[PDB]
Amino acid sequence: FVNQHLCGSHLVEALYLVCGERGFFYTPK
Amino acid sequence: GIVEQCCTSICSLYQLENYCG
Secondary structure (H helix, E strand, O other): OOOOOOOHHHHHHOOOOOHHOOEEOOOOO | HHHHHOOOOOOOOOHOOOOEE
């Protein structure tokens, strides 16, 4: 599900699903 | 950054995992 254009909340949701318990940082510049 | 690699271009699992903790 990750090999597409992921924007806005959809990108943050992908990070949440992929990273799991590792957490993530979202820095849109 | 992530927007340029995953929103304005096509994302990848490698790129997403670059931002995991």
